[PDB]
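Sample 3 of the quickstart, ligand geneticin:
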Amino acid sequence: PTRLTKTRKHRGNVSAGKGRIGKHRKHPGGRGKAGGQHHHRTNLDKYHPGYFGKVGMRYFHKQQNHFWRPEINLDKLWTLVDSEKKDEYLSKSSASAAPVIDTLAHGYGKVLGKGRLPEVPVIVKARFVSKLAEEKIRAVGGVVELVA
Amino acid sequence: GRDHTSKQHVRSGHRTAPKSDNVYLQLLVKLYSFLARRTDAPFNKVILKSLFLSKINRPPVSVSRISRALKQKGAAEKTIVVVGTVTDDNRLLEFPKATIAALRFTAGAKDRILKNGGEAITLDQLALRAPKGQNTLIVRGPRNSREAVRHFGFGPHKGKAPRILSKGRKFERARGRRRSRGFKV
Amino acid sequence: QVAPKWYQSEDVPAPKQTRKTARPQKLRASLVPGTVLILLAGRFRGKRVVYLKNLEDNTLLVSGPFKVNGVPLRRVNARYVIATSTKVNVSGVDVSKFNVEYFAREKEIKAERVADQKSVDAALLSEIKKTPLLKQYLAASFSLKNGDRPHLLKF
RNA sequence: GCGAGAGACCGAUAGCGAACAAGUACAGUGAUGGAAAGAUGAAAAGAACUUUGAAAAGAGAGUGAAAAAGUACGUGAAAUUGUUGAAAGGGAAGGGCUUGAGAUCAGACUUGGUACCGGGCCAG
RNA sequence: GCCUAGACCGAGGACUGCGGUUUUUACCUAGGAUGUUGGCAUAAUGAUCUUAAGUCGCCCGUCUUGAAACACGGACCAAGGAGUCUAACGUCUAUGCGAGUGUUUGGGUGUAAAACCCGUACGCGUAAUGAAAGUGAACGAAGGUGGGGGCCCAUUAGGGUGCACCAUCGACCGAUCCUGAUGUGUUCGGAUGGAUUUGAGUAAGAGCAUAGCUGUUGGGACCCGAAAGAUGGUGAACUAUGCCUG
RNA sequence: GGCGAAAGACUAAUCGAACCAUCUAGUAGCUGGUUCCUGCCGAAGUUUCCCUCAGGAUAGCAGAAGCUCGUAUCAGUUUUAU
RNA sequence: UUGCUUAAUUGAACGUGGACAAUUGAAUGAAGAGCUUUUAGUGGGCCAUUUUUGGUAAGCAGAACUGGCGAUGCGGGAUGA
RNA sequence: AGCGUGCUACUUAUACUUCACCGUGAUUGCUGUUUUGACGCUUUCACGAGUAGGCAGGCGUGGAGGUCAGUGACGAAGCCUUUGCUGUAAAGCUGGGUCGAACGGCCUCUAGUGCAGAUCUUGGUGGUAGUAGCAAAUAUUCAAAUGAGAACUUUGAAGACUGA
Ligand SMILES: CN[C@@H]1[C@@H](O)[C@@H](O[C@@H]2[C@@H](O)[C@H](O[C@H]3O[C@H]([C@@H](C)O)[C@@H](O)[C@H](O)[C@H]3N)[C@@H](N)C[C@H]2N)OC[C@]1(C)O
Ligand SMILES: CN[C@@H]1[C@@H](O)[C@@H](O[C@@H]2[C@@H](O)[C@H](O[C@H]3O[C@H]([C@@H](C)O)[C@@H](O)[C@H](O)[C@H]3N)[C@@H](N)C[C@H]2N)OC[C@]1(C)O
Ligand SMILES: CN[C@@H]1[C@@H](O)[C@@H](O[C@@H]2[C@@H](O)[C@H](O[C@H]3O[C@H]([C@@H](C)O)[C@@H](O)[C@H](O)[C@H]3N)[C@@H](N)C[C@H]2N)OC[C@]1(C)O
Ligand SMILES: CN[C@@H]1[C@@H](O)[C@@H](O[C@@H]2[C@@H](O)[C@H](O[C@H]3O[C@H]([C@@H](C)O)[C@@H](O)[C@H](O)[C@H]3N)[C@@H](N)C[C@H]2N)OC[C@]1(C)O
Ligand SMILES: CN[C@@H]1[C@@H](O)[C@@H](O[C@@H]2[C@@H](O)[C@H](O[C@H]3O[C@H]([C@@H](C)O)[C@@H](O)[C@H](O)[C@H]3N)[C@@H](N)C[C@H]2N)OC[C@]1(C)O
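Result:
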């Protein structure tokens, strides 16, 4: 609200806080990103290195949907098990009856390997998997099943 | 006149009250101001200063950090004190029986504490059942984990994150960040 | 307007225990009973009277004598008097019954006061006549003449 | 364009340029440019009549709750001006501080209590 | 040690202290003024206005090293008159929820632009790195060392546990350089081990949303101010020149 | 564009490029102004880069918010040694 | 301890265990120490003592250290940054 | 009452010393007496110059939600005024006059919210000042009539001019 601004406190003081010498003027220094290579180089080279120039190759008509692959780590993987049967699955799961985890149906593209699993067999369904993620899944007695 | 050896009329620079207008936080400040004034237990004074802290200075404390604190040698029975929010952590495999005193518990954190037979209590209950902070263990969250902290003190060769709106190859990866484009800083 | 609050009390605190135990006046060495005085202020300013007795209210008892001057037995304040070096022997005057209560406020003058004035005048005139010109000196008013410097003058 | 309902909007130098006989009056050869200007009172009851004046008007009177509302009309500020009273004034005036003089204002005989008690102020 | 002359002040408001004198569970000059008397209340007293006297006092605003300036604006008065709103953002703070968070595009409903209710997506966060093909975060109690509030055990000291945060030596993921196992569409694969290299990474999540001040950028952008440039129109009643008729 | 026995003259008091409306609140590193009170703190005219020299960015000097702690080792100063 | 180093059982760097306690190894001071974020104005200066360059010199022009004025009234120098 | 030099007293700054009061910063203590303000009360010490500029706490204006079952034709708002009072101040309140229909306190919300200046805008008004001035084109006069009023109208008499 206007009653809380410093404009109200500057009333009666000549320069409105902008100085007598400098004198708030229209556009000293130019408009926008003007002078980025000339008189604003000391700002851009300090706070935005990399600004000027070209790196890498172009990609005409890039479709971002081709690259959709949300990641889930092993330390989070049991959140996908139904919450009402998680406690039971942790106790009763064996090599002959293990929980199935359909990661793609939960909206994930790749299973990554950060963290530690419960020492319980699981069946993990995924489009992609990292080398360590599968190795940790097989070490608790589980398996990764590739789906498309 | 005076040849002053320090700046005159300088405020202490420390917060002496909560900026908050929550009346119940004020009730807690009232209780712990009494406790810090009349008891000379160092714990009560620490708790009093903590009640003044702003939100970013009270980072949330997860139940996994609490469990690691409870695994310290001799600390399995201590009362965990958090002046702030206790949050759930779904990366945790097990959580023990424990008494946690906090300002706020998220629903998941409270369900997990209660399910393992523990107790989730507020700070006034803590004052009643430990007026000097006996057998307590204060746990603080990570202050510097804030995303804003990544951009502090940015400069050449500093290794801090730039303040940038979009991320990609066309956004500040050329001259100044690459020897093939002039120089690298 | 700002309305008064509950905690605003009208209670009047008692004062603290003052430690001002008063102790008796020490008059000037020049004030001795029988000293002739010059009145510096009041109705009788300029009169030369006889100092009789120190009263317990700090004041001085003086008489003209009323016959010589026209000023009676009355109180004067020591700060409004010049004490000269002329002395009257007043061992023969009885002033044992003049005190603060004797001038308690009640023209017409009580027969007590007139009788006392006659009695004191009798003894004073007995004693005053022994010094030549003392009666005429007491009858005359004091004034400052031209060239009279009180810092240089002895009284 | 036609028909409606609204607003934490503006309130006659504002709000459309225009609340009014406003795209008017008026200017320019022309294209165009373009104002100012709202309110007596409930009701004209808008002051009959007499008198002075050439008349405009004045003075009485009259109406009205009011004429300190008279179509120069609600209230009616300031600059500026007249009259009246008071005061000051040798090539400016005005200001601060201090006191005097003159004027104004204020307060304890209290919400006084019951001839006495006791209080208020200024002083030794 | 003693005597003696003046001036200004009197903050505080039961008691509580330190001392002293002791003749006393007492008294004092010792943690800040009391006693007494006169006058006045038709007033001595205090404030303001006007004016006199004494003393001091240049005209404000502004640019400026420097203004009373022979620098500029200002004859006077009223009313109007200049950091705003918006899109997107940085820091800080308050609040709700929290590994999530955001009802309001839309649908339901209504006492009808409100209030109340609903969810799929989507945004941002939960993973990084590389130009890219791609690959993708625990040797260990999520490590060692030195500090570290608080807590625990003692009995100054001392012993333990030590979150946040800090210094330091490592470990993990991506990029780069080397090595090159079992194998092979024999040119692929990349086990394993190295490297004063490199990243806006990991190492028991901290974010999302609303609001507020300040700061930023684009916008008429605090307000008023060019000389110019462009598009479409109107003029030869003046005047320049030709022509026609007087 | 006209028109000029030529002066850059004249083209409706307008001519080294008329008038009118619009683009248009054109842009201005330049001049002017910028509206209430008290309280606390309190500068700079210097460094580097800039078609930079009446302007900016950058560092410095200033304010604000604090935060971690509570005598730890600090100082526009001396002494001793070097 | 080590993959560095020595002819080496030599060193180097970092350590376990033991000992040395308020004179923990000069003075004086210390409205405490450390740490972070964010943003304003400014980026024409000028004067004095001393050192000092160009110039005949200048209330001229240009440097050094400190104090000032600017941004500051007050008493004195009649008057005066 | 000059110059050199020594001495005694004396004069007075917003400086120093003691004391009062305001504020700022720090500081002592306060819950079986914490008592409806603990954002409060209380003990003690030190400090106070300031342009540009930063921040804090307040004052004032239009309009909005809530509240005072607030003020008001027995006089709201506005305006004038040595009637005074309060606040360091921004300002708030009140007596008297004028006036005629609405308006205010408190808790909050919100903004087209505060003027001395801009050769600012519109309107209004001064000093200047009863002043500059009302002087080219030959020139007017007597009487009567009319009329409240005649240098200026009309008629008569005359003197003139334009000079085809
Ligand atoms: C007969 N003269 C007319 C006259 O009617 C005039 O009217 C004003 C009138 O407008 C005023 O009245 C005014 O009232 C208020 C307030 C300021 O008074 C104004 O805001 C409003 O505009 C106006 N109606 C009035 N007080 C006087 C008349 N001469 O309007 C113009 C005019 C030519 O002068
Ligand atoms: C412990 N040191 C390791 C160092 O050994 C190295 O590890 C390489 C690793 O980079 C190689 O891996 C590399 O090359 C393979 C490619 C060959 O398929 C890629 O898939 C992979 O993404 C890439 N990182 C791996 N193939 C062998 C390790 N020793 O990686 C760097 C390091 C962390 O410093
Ligand atoms: C391949 N040789 C490695 C050498 O490169 C180095 O490893 C670095 C390591 O120091 C870096 O890590 C460094 O930087 C990270 C930062 C990026 O967050 C810090 O977290 C970390 O503390 C710091 N040590 C790590 N990012 C890459 C390794 N190759 O460590 C020594 C070594 C084993 O010789
Ligand atoms: C208790 N376990 C800790 C674990 O918490 C974690 O600690 C990190 C620590 O490594 C980080 O610190 C690290 O990264 C910073 C960074 C600025 O690059 C480096 O400067 C620093 O040298 C490096 N150690 C610190 N910033 C946060 C802690 N939680 O990693 C180290 C650890 C010992 O395993
Ligand atoms: C022996 N070396 C001296 C050096 O000490 C110094 O001398 C100053 C002298 O110049 C000062 O004097 C200076 O300043 C005063 C005054 C303004 O203070 C002036 O009146 C004087 O003219 C001026 N020279 C004097 N007051 C003190 C000495 N130490 O400067 C001069 C010098 C010759 O270099």
